[PDB]
Amino acid sequence: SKQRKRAVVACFRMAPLYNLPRHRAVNLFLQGYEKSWIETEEHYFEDKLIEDLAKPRVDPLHQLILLFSRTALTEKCKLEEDFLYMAYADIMAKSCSFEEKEMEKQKLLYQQARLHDRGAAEMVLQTISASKGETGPMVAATLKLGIAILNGGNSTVQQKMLEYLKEKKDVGFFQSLAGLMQSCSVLDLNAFERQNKAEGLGMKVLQDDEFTCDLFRFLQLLCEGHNSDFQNYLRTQTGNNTTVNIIISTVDYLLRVQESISDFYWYYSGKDVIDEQGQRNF
Amino acid sequence: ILELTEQEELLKFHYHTLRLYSAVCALGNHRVAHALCSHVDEPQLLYAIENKYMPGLLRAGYYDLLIDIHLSSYATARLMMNNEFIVPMTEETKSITLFPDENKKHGLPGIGLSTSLRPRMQFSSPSFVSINNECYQYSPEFPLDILKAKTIQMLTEAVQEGSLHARDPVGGTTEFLFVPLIKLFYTLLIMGIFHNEDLKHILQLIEPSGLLQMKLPEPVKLQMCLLLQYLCDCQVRHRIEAIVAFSDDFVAKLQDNQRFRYNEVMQALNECPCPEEIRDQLLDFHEDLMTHCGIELDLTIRGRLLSLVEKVTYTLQQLISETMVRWAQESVIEDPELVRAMFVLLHRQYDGIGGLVRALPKTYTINGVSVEDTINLLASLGQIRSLLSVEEEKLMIRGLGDIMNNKVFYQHPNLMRALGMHETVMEVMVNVLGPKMVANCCRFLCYFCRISRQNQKAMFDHLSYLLENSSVGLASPAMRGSTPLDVAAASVMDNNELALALREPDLEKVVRYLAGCGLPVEGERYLDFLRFAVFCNGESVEENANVVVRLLIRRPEGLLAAMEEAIKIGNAIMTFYAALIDLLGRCAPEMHLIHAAKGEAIRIRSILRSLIPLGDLVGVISIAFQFCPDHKAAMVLFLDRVYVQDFLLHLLGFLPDLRAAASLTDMALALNRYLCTAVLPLLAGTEHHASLIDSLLHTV
Amino acid sequence: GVEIETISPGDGRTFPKKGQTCVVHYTGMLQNGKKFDSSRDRNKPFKFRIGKQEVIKGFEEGAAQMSLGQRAKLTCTPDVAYGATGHPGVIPPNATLIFDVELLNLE
Amino acid sequence: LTEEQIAEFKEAFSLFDKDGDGTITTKALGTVMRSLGQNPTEAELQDMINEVNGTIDFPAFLTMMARKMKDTDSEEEIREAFRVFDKDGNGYISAAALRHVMTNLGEKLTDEEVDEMIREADIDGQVNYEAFVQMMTA
Amino acid sequence: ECLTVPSGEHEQRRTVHYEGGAVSVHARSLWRLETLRVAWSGSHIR
Amino acid sequence: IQRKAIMHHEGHMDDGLNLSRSQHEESRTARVIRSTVFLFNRFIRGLDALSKKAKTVDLPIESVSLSLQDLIGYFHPPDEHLEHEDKQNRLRALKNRQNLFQEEGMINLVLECIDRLHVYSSVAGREAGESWKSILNSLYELLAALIRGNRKNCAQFSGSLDWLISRLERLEASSGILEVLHCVLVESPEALNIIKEGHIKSIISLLDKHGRNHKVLDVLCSLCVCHGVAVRSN
C-alpha cells in the first residue's frame, strides 16, 4: 500500500545511528529501561502482609475493610477511582496426590477464612452496587477480589451474601448487574477491518474481554455447589421491590456473542487461510 | 492578650477575626498580603510563637496567619513540582553516587546534593512608598534563620517536656501544643530550609537510629504522617538523581560501543554481514536501545547493569512498617482521612518498585545551556497552574505569551506533554465555558498540536469532549486558530493512523450540529473539519468516507441553480456549496474501483452520480471569466473523481488568465493556482494550443 | 508643607544631595496614634533615591532637610499623602501622617 | 532534527522580530533567510509566503526550513545508507543482497515485499539504487 | 411515562396531562384509590 | 410531552396505563404537603383580611405555630450519635424530603408569608398577634432547614438573595436571615458569583450596627472562599 512505501523510505532515513548529541540517547535509554526492566517480581509480600495485619481492639485489616465499606455506603451518583482501593483489592486478591488436594483445599479455605470473618464479602457486594452501569477499572478490581473470595465456592460466603441481600433489601445491586451485562462487549464487525488496515498501513478490538471473563466467572462462583435458594433468587427476586430476571439477560448476552461469532464466520467464509490476528482474536 | 483568656465572648470573636485574616489572603493575593503585613505587626507573630501562656485557640490562629501570609505561595509552588524530576546533565549531576561509600545502610535522607531544578522564590519589601509593582510582586518577606533556630528549640522543648506528660501543656490540649507547631515545621521543611546541619539534629530528635514513640491524639499523628510521607518523597528524589548520575556514565560506553562495532563491520572485507546491517537499521534510536537493553536480559558491559539493578534495590521503611501497624492496633481509629493517610504510606513502603514505575516517566535530562529558559518556563507554568484555581484572563494571556517564546519548548517537545500542561490548559478552557480567553487557549493548543507527531495522539484523546462546544466557533475573523472545532481539526491532519482511529459517534455529533444549518455561514467550518476528516494524505480513506456520505444522504440540507441564482447579491452560500462539493469529491477512489469492482464502492459512486448531474459545467464556464480563483478548483476536484475526449473538448478557457499578465488584484490569485488545477485534465484543440502557447509566452 | 521638628540632630548641616541613596529607619503612625509601618521593626534600613522620586513628597522634602544621624518628625499633609482616596488597604482616605524618621547614611 | 539549528532559527526569527508575538513582515523573510544563509529566487520566496497573512508564524517556518534541510539530508542519507554496503563505489546492489537487506528492521514484513522488489528492480545482479529510489518514492 | 397534573403556580391545577421523564418519581404524579364501601375499604383490589 | 388526557369511547392502542406503587414516607410527605398548603393559604388570606381593612374577622395562629414547630422538628438533621450507615439512611431520607418540598415550591410560599408578615412592630387584635416575634423566628428557622443539604435547591433559591440583603437591616429578626444566608452561601458557588458590592457594604454596615457578631465573620469568610477556590474581587 501507499504509506508503507514512505515508511520504508523512513526506515532508510534513520541514518543517524549514534550521532545523538549527548542526552537524547540518555533520555531514550531512560525510557527503554523503565519500559523493559522494572517489571519484576517482589510479589511474595502479599502473604507476609495479610499475615502481618491480623496480629491483634479490632484488627487493622478490619479497619481497612470497614473504611471501604463506609466509603461505599456514601452516595456519589458516580464512583471515583481511588488507587488506594485499586491497590488493596489486588493485594488481597493475590493472597489465594490425593493428600495434596487435601492440603490445597485447606490452605485455600483458611486464606478465605482470613477475610470473610471481617465482613469482606459485603464491601465487594456493595461496591458492585455503587456503580450503576459504569464499567471502570474499579469494577474489575472488585470482581477480581470477589472471585478470589469465592474461588472454591465457600457455602458460608454464599449464605453470607444471601443473608445480606435478604436483610438490606436492594434492587440497585441487581439493577447494577443488569446494567453491567447490557454492554460488557460484543466481538466486532468492522473494528477488525479498520484494525487490520491500520496495522498494515501504520507499521483494541476486545479491550473489554477479561472483564467479562471475570464477571461471568464471578456469577458462576455464586452458584457453585447448588445453592438452590440462591439459584431461585436470581430468577424471581422476591424480597426486593421490582424483579430483574437476570437469566434471560445472560441468555441475551450469549445471543449477542453468538451472532457476532457468526458474522466473523462470513468474513472468513471464503479466504480460508486465517491470519495470526484472526486466530488471536478468535 | 494574656488577660483575655477568660473573656470568652471577646475570645471567640477575636478568634474569628484571625480566622478571617487567614481566610482572605488565600492563594497568592500579595496585594492584600502587604496590607495585612501592615496590620499584623511582623514581630508580634514572632512573640506569639513563644508565649507559653496564650490560649491554644489564638496560638493556632497566629501560626496559621504566619503560614498564610509569608509561606503559602512558595509552599504550593514546590507542592506542584514535587513530581517532575527534571535534572541537568553536568558533572555536578554526575557527582552523585547513590550510597554512603560502600556501606550496608541507607543514606539518612537529609543529603544536600540536590541537582534537580526545584523552582525558587523571590520576596517583596512591604515598605509604604509608591508602587513598584510591589502589590503584584512575588510575596511579602520574612526572616528565615530566626524561624529555623527558634522552631528547632520549640521542637526539642516540646519533646523533652511533653514526653514527661505534663498536665499543663500550653493550650490545654497537647493538640494545641503540637499541631500548629508541627504544621509550621512541615511547611517550613518543604521550602528548602533546614539544611544538613539541623537535619542531623531533627533526625536525632525523631530517628534515633525519640519523637514518634510518644502517645498522641489524632491530628498530631496526621501531621506526623505527612512529614513522614515527605521524607519518602525525598528518598525518591535522591534515588532518581542517582540513577541519572549512573546513566551518564553508562550511555557513552554504549555509544562508543555501537559506533565502534559499525566501524568494525565496515572495516572488514568479508550475505551474512547483511543481518548486522539489518540490526543497525531500526526505525529510530528507540528500537536500537530496546535491542541493546533486552540483549542484557537473558558484551561484558551488561554485567554493570546486572550489578546496578541490585544496587537500586533500595531501615526507615521497616520502622514505618512497624509503627503504622502499631498505631492501627493499639489506638482504634476514627477520622477516615487519617485511615487513608495511614494505608497510603503503608502500601507505598512496599510499592517502592511501583512508585518508581510511577516516577520515571516524568524525569528528564537537559543540557547545561538551556537551564535558565527551563527555569523561566517552569516558573510561568507554575504561575498559570496557580491561576487554575480562581483581570484573571490578562494574567493568563501574559503567561501563555511567555510560554510561546521558549527554546526548550521546541528543543524538548517531549517535556511539554510530560508535564501534562496541555491537560491543564484544557481544564482552564473547561472552567471558562458552561470572551477572548478561549480564543487564546484554542490558539495555544492548535499551536501545540503540530510540534511532533505523538503529541497529536494526546491531543486526540479529548475529541469526544472537544466537539461538544462547537457553537462557540461563529462569525468572527478571529476564528481560524480560535475554535475548539479548530483544535479538533488540528488533531487530525497528519496521521493516517489517527484518522482511522476515530469512530462514528463523533461524526454523529458533527452531522447533528450540521443539520441545524438549514438557513448559514457556520456550516462551512463543519465542512472544513469533515474535509480534514476524510482525505488526510493526498489520498482519501474510504472508511470514514462511507459513513460521511451515508449521513449526508440522510440530509444534505433546485440546489444547482440556487448557487447559480445569487452570485451577484455575502460570500456565505457561495463558499458553503464550495465546501459541500469539496467534501463529496473525497470519496470513491480508483485503485479499489477502476482496478477492480469492489461492490459498494460502485454504489457510493452511483450515489455521487445521482447528485449534481454534470450541470457543474455551468459553474465551470461561468466562474472562469468574472469567487473566481477558489470555487472552480473545488468543482474540478468533484469532476475529477466521480466523472471521452470529445466531451473533454466540449468543456471549453485560460485566455482571461493571460489577459492580465501585467495589470494585476484577486486576479493575481488564480495565476499559479490553475498551474496545478488545469493539470488534472492531462487525462478548438488548436485554439487551446494557441492559448496555452500564449500562457507559455506569458511565462517565457 | 511638612512641619519638621528635629527630635535629635545629627550635625544639622550635612543634608544630602541628589544621586545619593538615603538610609532611614522610620516608624510611621497615624494622626490617631495608630501604628501602621515601621522600618525599624523588620530590622532593615529602608533605602531610596532622591531624584528617582519613589517615596512620597513630604518624605522627600524631609529627605533633603535632615542631616547625618538626624531624627525628626515629618508631619505631612493628607494632600501630600496617598490622597483623598488614600492607600487601597492600609491608609484610610485623607489620613494626616505623623512619622519618626532617622536618616543614617548616604552613597 | 538537531537542537542548535532550532536554537539558531528561533534566535534569528526573534532577532528580526520586534514586538515578539510571532509577527514579522513578509519582506523580511528574504532578510531572515539570507541571515540564515538561505537564498532562493524571488518567485520561490513568494510561493513560500503564499504557503503561509502579513505576519509569518513560527512553527510552519520551522516546517518549511525542515523541508529544505531534510532535502539535502535525505540525499546524504541515501548516500551513506548504501555506503554501508557496496564498498567499491558504484552504487550497485546485487539482488541476493537485496533479499538479504530488504528484510531489515523497521518494517520487516513477509515475502510479499521482497517479491515486490524483485519483480521490478532492473537486474543486469548489480542494480543501481536510483531506480529503487524512483520506485519507492512514487 | 406517568400520569401527571401540571406544576406549581397554575388553573389552580385543574387540568390533566401526561408527562414522561422525571416528574414520575416526583410528588404530583400520585393518586389515592377509594372505593364505595366504608367497611373493607382496605381489602384487595379486583 | 404535554400529551393531553381526554376520555374516549374507544381510545388507541397506546392507552396501556401501567402501575407502580409509592413508598410510605413519600405518602407521608405528600399528605404533609397538602396539610401545609391548606394551612398557609388560610394564613395568607387572614393576613389579607386584616391588612387592608380593620374588620370579628379571624385568622389561624396557634395551630400555625404548632404546625410550624412540627415542621421544624420534621427536617431535623440527624445527630452525632447514630450508626454511620443509619446516619446516611436518615440523611438520604432527609434530602428526599427536601427535594420533594423544593419541586412543589413551598419556599416561595413561605417567603411571601414573610412578606405579608414583615410589616409592623407590635393591624390585628395584638393579643392574638402577640407571638409575632416567635412566628417570624420559627419561619426563619424553617427556611434555614429547607436548604442546608441540597446544592441544587440553594443554587435555585439564589435569585432571591437581593430581598434577603434588603431585609438584613430589620434589627429585629436579622439573625435568622443571617443563618439562612450563611447556609446558602456555603453550598453553592453559583450564589457567590451573584453577590455584589453594596451587599457586602450592607453586611459590614450590619456589623457596624449590631456590636461584634462572630457569625458575620463566618459569613465573610464563607464569601471569601468557595468549595476549593477563591474569588479575588470580593
Task: Write the CA distances from F115 to A261, B395, F111, F134, integer angstroms.
Answer: 70, 45, 6, 16
Asked about C50 being catalytic, the answer comes back as: no
Angle at A256 between CA A251 and CA A260, to 5 degrees: 145
Query: Catalytic: which of C11, C36, C41, C79?
Result: C36
Residue C43's region, left for phi above 0, alpha for psi from -120 to 50, else beta, is left
Chain centre to alpha carbon of residue F43: 16
**Å between A81 CA and nearest CA of chain F:** 20
Closest CA to C86 of B38, B265, B681: B38
Cell numbers that stand for D42 in this block: 524571488
CB contact at 8 A, B253 and B372: no
Query: Catalytic: which of C26, C50, C59, C91?
Result: C26
Give chain A positions within 8 Å (CB) of B366.
23
A165-168, long-range: CB < 8 A, 24+ apart: A165/A125, A165/A233, A165/A239, A165/A240, A166/A239
Give chain C positions within 8 Å (CB) of B45.
none
Cβ neighbours of B412 (radius 10 Å): 23
Tell if the CB–CB gap between F229 and B29 is shorter than 8 Å.
no
Asked about C56 being catalytic, the answer comes back as: yes
Coil, strand, or helix at residue C97? strand
Coil, strand, or helix at residue F10? coil
Give chain A positions within 8 Å (CB) of F150.
none
Residues A171-200: b if buried by 16+ CB within 10 A, e if exposed:
bebbbbbbbbbeebbebbeebbebbebbee
Looking at residue F230, the DSSP 8-state letter turns out to be: B
CB contact at 8 A, B558 and B577: no
Cell numbers that stand for B316 in this block: 526507615
Cβ neighbours of B222 (radius 10 Å): 19
What is the rounded CA–CA span in Å between residue B380 and residue B374?
10
Phi and psi torsions of C103, nearest 5°: -80, 135
Question: If you search the block for the grid coordinates 418540598, which residue do you land on?
Answer: F101
A188-194, long-range: CB < 8 A, 24+ apart: A188/A260, A188/A264, A188/A281, A189/A260, A189/A263, A190/B543, A192/A264, A192/A267, A192/A277, A192/A278, A192/A281, A193/B543, A194/B500, A194/B543
Measured between its terminal Cα atoms, the distance across chain B in Å is: 97
| Burial bucket for residue B15 (CB in 10 Å: 0-12, 13-18, 19+) | middle
Coil, strand, or helix at residue B610? coil
- Closest CB to E18: pick one of F5, F26, F104: F5
| DSSP letters spanning B178-240 | HHHHHHHHHHHHHTT-S-HHHHHHHHHHH-----TTS---HHHHHHHHHHHHHHHHHHHHHHH
Cell numbers that stand for B615 in this block: 450541470
**Å between D71 CA and nearest CA of chain A:** 11
- Closest CB to B278: pick one of D3, D10, D101: D101
- HEC string of B275-310 equals HHHHHCCCCCHHHHHHHHHHCCCCCCCHHHHHHHHH
Angle at B507 between CA B501 and CA B510, to 5 degrees: 140
**Å between E29 CA and nearest CA of chain F:** 10
Coil, strand, or helix at residue A159? helix
Residues 6+ positions from F28 with CB-CB distance below 8 Å: none
User: Taking the CA atoms of chain B, what radius of gyration do you get in angstroms?
Assistant: 35
Partner chains of B (3+ C-beta pairs under 8 Å): A, C, D, F
Closest CA to B672 of B646, B639, B637, B698: B698
Cell numbers that stand for A149 in this block: 473470595
Chain centre to alpha carbon of residue B128: 40
Asked about C82 being catalytic, the answer comes back as: yes
Closest CA to A64 of B237, B327, D35, D53: B327
Question: If you search the block for the grid coordinates 534537580, which residue do you land on?
Answer: B116
CB contact at 8 A, B271 and D97: yes
- HEC string of B180-195 equals HHHHHHHHHHHCCCCC
CB pairs under 8 A between B and C: 41
Angle at B320 between CA B319 and CA B325, to 5 degrees: 105
What is the rounded CA–CA span in Å between residue B559 and residue B581?
12
Tell if the CB–CB gap between A84 and B347 is shorter than 8 Å.
yes
Tell if the CB–CB gap between F100 and E9 is shorter than 8 Å.
no
Cell numbers that stand for B388 in this block: 487554575
Asked about C37 being catalytic, the answer comes back as: yes
Cell numbers that stand for B106 in this block: 541507607
Residue C101: enclosing H or E segment and its boundaries? strand C101-103
What is the rounded CA–CA span in Å between residue C15 and residue F45?
84
Query: Catalytic: which of C15, C56, C98, C100?
Result: C56
**Closest alpha carbon within chain D to A8:** D107
- HEC string of C44-95 equals CCEEEECCCCCCCHHHHHHHCCCCCCEEEEEEECCCCCCCCCCCCCCCCCCC
Phi and psi torsions of B77, nearest 5°: -65, -35
Amino acid at A227: N
**Closest alpha carbon within chain F to B26:** F230
CB contact at 8 A, D12 and D36: yes
Query: Catalytic: which of C15, C37, C98, C100?
Result: C37
Give chain A positions within 8 Å (CB) of B254.
25, 29
Cβ of residue D78 closer than 8 Å to a chain A Cβ: yes
- Closest CB to D7: pick one of B281, B411, B447: B411
What is the rounded CA–CA span in Å between residue B522 and residue B81?
43
What is the rounded CA–CA span in Å between residue B506 and residue B465?
10
Cell numbers that stand for B61 in this block: 490562629
What is the rounded CA–CA span in Å between residue B110 and residue B90?
22
Q: How many helices (H) and strands (E) does chain B have?
A: 37, 2
Cβ of residue B218 closer than 8 Å to a chain A Cβ: no
Cell numbers that stand for A48 in this block: 507476609
Cβ of residue B247 closer than 8 Å to a chain A Cβ: yes
Asked about C48 being catalytic, the answer comes back as: no
Give chain F positions within 8 Å (CB) of E17.
2-5
CB pairs under 8 A between A and F: 8
Q: Do chains A and B touch (3 or more CB pairs under 8 A)?
A: yes
**Å between A241 CA and nearest CA of chain F:** 10
**Å between B680 CA and nearest CA of chain D:** 17
Up-side HSE of residue B176: CA atoms within 13 Å toward CB?
18
Asked about C15 being catalytic, the answer comes back as: no
**Closest alpha carbon within chain F to A76:** F92
Question: If you search the block for the grid coordinates 523503565, which residue do you land on?
Answer: A34
Q: Return residues 17-36 of B near F (CB < 8 Å).
A: 17, 19-20, 23-24, 26-27, 29
The reported resolution of this PDB entry, expressed in Å, is 4.2
Cell numbers that stand for A103 in this block: 492440603
Cell numbers that stand for B499 in this block: 484518522
Cβ neighbours of D4 (radius 10 Å): 13
Coil, strand, or helix at residue B382? helix
What is the rounded CA–CA span in Å between residue B202 and residue B347?
26
Cell numbers that stand for B144 in this block: 528565615
What is the rounded CA–CA span in Å between residue B66 and residue B78?
18
Tell if the CB–CB gap between F232 and B389 is shorter than 8 Å.
no
Give chain B positions within 8 Å (CB) of F212.
9, 13
What is the rounded CA–CA span in Å between residue C9 and residue D8?
62
Residue C102: enclosing H or E segment and its boundaries? strand C101-103
